[PDB]
Paper text:
ADPKD is caused by mutations in either the PKD1 or [name] gene encoding PKD1 and [name], respectively. [name] shares an overall architecture with other TRP channels, i.e., six transmembrane segments (S1–S6), a pore loop between S5 and S6, and intracellularly localized N- and C-termini. By directly measuring currents in primary cilia of renal collecting duct epithelial cells of conditional PKD1 or [name] knockout mice, [name] was recently shown to be an essential K+ and Na+ permeable ion channel in primary cilia independent of PKD16. An extracellular tetragonal opening for polycystins (TOP) domain between the S1 and S2 helices contributes to channel assembly and likely participates in recognition of unidentified ligand(s), but whether and how this domain is implicated in [name] channel activation has yet to be determined.
Using screening mutagenesis, we identified an activating mutant [name] that gave rise to robust cation currents when expressed in Xenopus oocytes, allowing us to further investigate [name] channel function. We determined a cryo-EM structure of the [name] [name] mutant to an overall resolution of 3.5 Å. Overall, the [name] mutant shared a similar tetrameric architecture and domain arrangements with WT [name]. No significant structural change was found in the TOP domain, ion selectivity filter or S1-S4 domain. However, the [name] mutation resulted in a kink in S5 and a displacement of the bottom half of S5 below 604 F/P, which leads to expansion of the activation gate that likely underlies the GOF phenotype. Interestingly, when comparing the [name] WT and [name] structures, the S4-S5 linker was shown to exhibit a notable conformational change: the N-terminal end of the linker in [name] moved outward, which led to a dramatic displacement of the cationic residue R581 that is normally conserved in the TRPP family. Here, by directly comparing S6 of [name] WT and [name] mutant, we found a transition of the π-helix in WT [name] to the canonical α-helix in [name] mutant. In contrast to the dramatic changes of distal S6, the proximal S6 above the π-helix remained rather stationary in [name], suggesting that the transition from π- to α-helix alone is sufficient to induce pore opening and channel activation. The twisting motion in [name] not only induced the gate residue L677 to rotate and point away from the pore center, but also resulted in turning of the precedent residue F676 towards the pore.
Residue numbers in the entry:
A (entry chain D), B (entry chain B), C (entry chain C), D (entry chain A): 216 to 295, 302 to 493, 504 to 682
The structure:
């Protein structure tokens, strides 16, 4: 039994570092600053030299146009090689051409209360597929004023903060040189390309680094709720498109192929309650998903080669970016669970044999104990979402309310804005919540001390 | 017994989601940003273009006048439809006309010490109903200089941060167009409409949004303590005045009527110690209060219809705003307790039968244990209020002192200003407090471990 | 026994609220903002209109002179009644005349290493009574350039942040009007009144409020370590000098006299281990000290009456301010202990009879348990003071190091500057400290669980 | 046995304060501000008068040159004695001459993917000893353009934040007067001395204070990752070079010599498991290392005397600085352990005899218990490093990830940027992590309660 356990043990052991190698391998070291520099160059810089606001600060259409005609242009251009080629920082190819896309909602999408109909001329509803405006508004001279479809326009429907956004919409592709772009943008500002009915806009472009080999894909996402104002959001994604430069990369490629053999091996083992079975399956399921993504999704790299043919177009990476994220997402989770699988054998046989007997024993009862606090914990969350959420960003969404309470329990708090929101309940809420939580838990010890 | 318990159970179950529907229904999703944009447009913007202060920063009369003649004007006007109609952000009707009101205290309200009487000419006491100045000061040409009564002037006495303020006072109603208003304001600054004896001022106006159907009521409240300086405060209240637009709204209306039947049903059940009885009554009491507010208070909507007749006046919503707050306040609390009522049945019968037996058992003793820390906890609070409260905002009020200590226990702290306040006791206070609290609790475990 | 205990009980009860009345009585409500406005007017305002620094920011002599010739002047003057009388905010008498005093250290106070003697001409040692420079430097035309003694110059030696400072030194008294003062200050800047050897400067003045009856005493304390630079510090003290205006004040006066009778009563009771005896004595001792301060120290009020004769001089309140602080300090502590005396009787007889038996029992052992962590806790404190304290303000002083660790345990942390200080030990220090502390305590439970 | 234990006890006792004296002695009091003033003068000041960025803010080459030609120059010069001698603050000798050094990487150090070779002309790899560029680029007129070796150029290879940096490189030594330096710097900017291939630059200079006797050594370290941008870092080190000024210093010198006798005494005692043996050895080992550093490393002081001959050169203290740090590092650790050695005797004999019996008993089992959380704690750390670390600075390095989680557990958190990084996993990560950690620990109590 021991040697058989030892075999599945050492097999697991090899499988460990192999994955650890891939992770450590597939992740370059200094990538962070590559983002941070990009981010600070765009997000963090004053909209205009005379302006005190960053991109994170944009409150208005005027704010937006300033930014577009502002640092964004200067952020995307340098002198400096073609000279149509502009190296960012001097170190970064601006890859292809940037693209701007917006969304628009129809006039009569909404309805005016009968009393104010004599007053109000028209309204514009919150964005929806139904409320989508496909009419060719404006001079209709270009894709800016001409509607297109996410089928026709290669792209993936994106999930925004207030709503999901279909890839389709009104878009425009920029120019190679800063001057030509400004000419385009000006017309887009001159003629009104941002009107009452424009809910969300996209600015997307890709950037390549030649020093280390990586691709920076940038999604600048600006929303315009029916309430007006501006909600800026951004995405900076590094990507490794070309897997082969160094032999070390080729060294990793063999590993992944070898890594596939392990999974192939474990899959057979899965054939036949149990908890660790329920645990082990999770590891395998995630594993398969990654590779499938890794191959028939990510290994495509068509758009690249397609872009490599003619580099004057827009190199849509949104999918490729989107997926490798999920890939990075999944793979990370696997490793996490991979470390967890360590316990069942090396610890249970000797060390935690005196623990698991207590651990798994109470683990059944722990379910019964933990029932009480959540309901209470959820109640405040629901309460706070009702009282607050019209006031404090932290309570804006019911989800974030839950998250906020953890920060509260851990001590991260903005108390002032709470008291500003409600001079009465908020303090009461804050106190009672914190108060009961301890008082609640202390009882649970006792019913645990029952044993 | 079980089926009878099952009936009161499923009955409770239906009553749950019905309320959940109403809450989820009566609360729109994106309302938060509607406030946030409004707030950031007023509270968060520089008083003047050359000025570095926000509305939250106002320290002086000069600060105030700048703000009034500053962003406030520009915040209330846009171009843009009448053109007397100015859409905020282009998306928001400025509803009716804004109104400014101030309070004033009589000359001899206070008394000078005999020694300095030769020095000081006059004083002005802290605001009170007695100290109220009803004399028609100044040119006496308008409501600005003419006192009016909260009976005559429709309004609700408001509860400020240092004091309650009667609705009566000296007020002025603005104009439709920004220019005419500035003319008014200038005269109010030219002639001195803010003098030694002006304790508190009000700026109130309402804003309607046509996209989603809502009303933003704004209370800008500025105080002037007898000590001078300025204490800014603000209120941004969304309101749903017209309950019927979508059929979904009509769907909710039937629910509330149906919802009333439940309460009517439970009221009869209340007829006849007990804790859960003491619990259940609370649910019912709050429930009734809400609906009464919901009907003969809020459903009035007279001022609206009154305003809808002639829109050039000031549409006082202060009550309507004030109440629906309380309504939102109460309803939220109900839901909270509604979730709590879950425990007594589903959990007690099976799961917490092994818990409630311990829970309710120690719940009696917990009262005896918890006595010790509060007295100690209160002592520091009272101590801190004596030592501090002349120094640190967090200790300014005895109430907030209590709240401050929680942040301290949870770790939210400004230590510097404390040490700045008192280089000696504060650190001692801070250390000892934190120190004993743990040391105190640890003992309480033992007397609990006694069982 | 019970009635006898009941008598000492109700006697204690009356004594409670009597003190509570005095405290609540002797403390006015809104005093806080009176300070806050004063503070924000001076500490918080830009040194110059073109300048971005506050008084808290001053790094240099130039910084200082700017401040003096800057906001300070404008902060002390308004238009506005005499007109030699300038009401601050229009609400506050500038009381008497402000005063500036500095300290100076002799040339050869220090000694140069023999190697650099050929290089360096002279040095100036850290401030000390020995290093004090009494020589009449400069043009010697005024108290600015003429040394005076704290005996001759009425004043109390003050305890600064790096050192205690004798009241004696070089001082100058300002003028009534802003213009005349600037003339003085300019000469003090024109001629060099701040030289290499000036360690510390004082700016002190008093301000009276006529609305509520109070006195604001302001100590602006600037230090110049031998290392150069500037360490600003400030003191804003409210004072109630005239105890009699309202009959309510007279109502309080009788109480304090009545309050004295209680102490007189308890003193006799003290005549005769015990803990509560050791407790009770503390209450009495502090009590006596307060009244003695209250009478033959504070009730003096001579300087006032002296100032009231001729108001053109400097009204030194430093003592009067200094003492009532200590008075407020002591009285607060008393109340704290007063609440503590509640336990021994009402709780011990019924409620905590089941607690004190455990409480006082383990209270002996708690001493033995708590020994271990302090030594460890102190060690890190001493360690951190060695590693840090040349880097992080929080560790600058060994005292503050201790305080810093509490914030760390409670979660208030600046981690960045720590890692900036030492990329190695700091993180190690931080981790290990936090780590052991929990690990340490958990053991202590067990030896407590021993019972 | 007791007297023998008493002898080793009192011997230890004397050894305690002797060290305490040395520490307290070897550390001057006010040193902190000496740094803080220096730091704030350089790190904290706007690059240019019109500029809003500090040295900590530098994002670019342009940023850098501005700083060099900016505050740095003004920070290093004052008027003021020679006049070639410029006293900083007027209180600080600029010691010798400052020095600037940079690093450079060869052209073909890296390799371009075959597809973009037609596009990209050249790349520059991340810094390495191999990638080092020793070619004499540029006009080759000076050490700026002429490569030198760390053998030839006296210096110690320094450990930077992204990489270790050999002392060798391209350097330049500044002038005595600000004007001459600017002439040098301009040429270095005029001609391009910062190119694509410059990874890291050094600015190093020393500053002496004559008031207290100390030396400030300044290392300004700027990095340029292959990704572009700028990573500023700084080091401000006080040093006591001349050990003899006051007799008190001579008093300390005898102590250290006497202090050596103790160690000499304890070394013999070490001759012969045990834990305290394992403890005691550590104390001795560290002790020896310090003195060896103290003598044949630090007591050298040659460069000083060498510099004292001719003061126009660059006084390299980098080693002397580097070592005394380690010295201060080690000595601090010793004291920490010195306090720890207290327990084994005074506490074990009487007080903790009732504790150590429990302490050391469970101390064996504690190892078994603590196994579970670390693996879990590490997992999140590894997970977070995979998910984050491309986004959040706090997760940038796997090491800092661990540190970040402590702040999270203690409550120090930036939640926003996390949610900004990943709208999904981050919140999930945050919640689950915090959630399990408590849930994990609670079980461990039970298996501990097993006893
Ligand atoms: C929107 O529809 C309303 C409804 O008749 C109409 O009055 C208004 O002119 C329309 N505006 C636009 C821009 O389509
Ligand atoms: C559409 O018409 C406008 C009106 O002159 C013109 O400025 C714009 O360039 C036209 N668009 C295109 C794509 O030609
Ligand atoms: C989508 O990709 C195809 C592939 O050649 C291309 O022809 C087409 O123009 C693309 N459509 C876009 C980018 O909207
Ligand atoms: C206020 O009353 C005092 C008391 O006589 C008087 O001297 C002063 O002129 C009055 N001022 C005003 C503005 O009423
Ligand atoms: C009151 O008189 C002043 C003095 O000219 C004048 O400016 C103001 O307009 C008058 N008020 C009204 C309401 O007419
Ligand atoms: C109060 O409301 C009534 C209702 O018509 C109106 O006539 C009156 O002018 C109002 N008073 C105010 C707004 O002061
Ligand atoms: C200080 O004393 C030194 C010692 O001789 C002397 O050289 C220097 O001139 C003196 N300076 C002043 C200002 O007294
Ligand atoms: C001292 O002499 C200077 C030199 O002119 C003069 O400016 C100053 O006013 C004099 N001081 C006094 C108090 O007269
Ligand atoms: C101290 O007070 C006495 C009291 O009259 C006064 O004569 C003297 O001038 C004062 N000395 C000062 C303020 O330096
Ligand atoms: C770098 O090497 C490449 C490879 O041939 C060459 O094309 C380029 O001109 C070189 N540039 C420099 C600055 O050495
Ligand atoms: C190297 O040549 C340049 C070109 O004129 C000159 O400016 C520079 O001063 C020279 N360097 C030295 C050290 O002479
Ligand atoms: C290293 O020190 C020696 C000692 O005299 C000196 O001659 C040489 O110039 C120094 N080299 C440097 C500072 O690069």
């Amino acid at each position: 039994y021991l040697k058989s356990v030892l075999r599945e043990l050492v097999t697991y052991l090899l499988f460990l570092i192999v994955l650890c190698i891939l992770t450590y391998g597939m992740m370059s070291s200094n990538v962070y600053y590559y983002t941070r520099m990009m981010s600070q160059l765009f997000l963090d810089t004053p909209v205009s030299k005379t302006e005190k606001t960053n991109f994170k600060t944009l409150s208005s259409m005027e704010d937006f146009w300033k930014f577009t005609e502002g640092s964004l242009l200067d952020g995307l251009y340098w002198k400096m090689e073609a000279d149509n080629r502009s190296f960012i920082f001097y170190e970064n190819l601006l890859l292809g051409v940037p693209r701007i896309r917006q969304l628009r909602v129809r006039n009569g999408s909404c309805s005016i209360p009968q009393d104010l109909r004599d007053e109000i001329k028209e309204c514009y509803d919150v964005y929806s597929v139904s409320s989508e405006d496909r009419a060719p508004f404006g001079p209709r001279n270009g894709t800016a004023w001409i509607y297109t479809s996410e089928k026709d326009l290669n792209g993936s429907s994106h999930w925004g903060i207030i709503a999901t956004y279909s890839g389709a919409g009104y878009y425009l592709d920029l120019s190679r040189t800063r001057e030509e772009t400004a000419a385009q943008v000006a017309s887009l500002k001159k003629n009104v390309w941002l009107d009452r009915g424009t809910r969300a806009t996209f600015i997307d472009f890709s950037v390549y680094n030649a020093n280390i080999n990586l691709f920076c894909v940038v999604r600048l996402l600006v929303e315009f709720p029916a309430t007006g104002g501006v909600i800026p959001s951004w995405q900076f994604q590094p990507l490794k498109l070309i897997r082969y430069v160094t032999t070390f990369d080729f060294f990793l490629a063999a590993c992944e192929i070898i890594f596939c053999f392990f999974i192939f091996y474990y899959v057979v083992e899965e054939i036949l309650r149990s908890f660790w079975n329920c645990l082990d399956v999770v590891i395998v399921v995630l594993s398969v998903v990654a590779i499938g993504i890794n191959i028939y999704r990510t290994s495509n790299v068509e758009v690249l080669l397609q872009f490599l043919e003619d580099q004057n177009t827009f190199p849509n990476f949104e999918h490729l970016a989107y997926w490798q994220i999920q890939f990075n997402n999944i793979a990370a989770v696997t490793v996490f669970f991979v470390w967890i699988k360590l316990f069942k054998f090396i610890n249970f046989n000797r060390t935690m044999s005196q623990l698991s007997t207590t651990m798994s024993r109470c683990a059944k009862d722990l379910f019964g104990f933990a029932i009480m606090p959540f309901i209470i914990f959820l109640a405040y969350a629901q309460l706070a979402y009702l009282v607050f959420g019209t006031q404090v960003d932290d309570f804006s969404t019911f989800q974030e309310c839950i998250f906020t309470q953890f920060r509260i329990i851990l001590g991260d708090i903005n108390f002032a804005e709470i008291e500003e929101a409600n001079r009465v309940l908020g303090p009461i809420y804050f106190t009672t919540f914190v108060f009961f939580m301890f008082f609640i838990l202390l009882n649970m010890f006792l019913a645990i001390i029952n044993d």
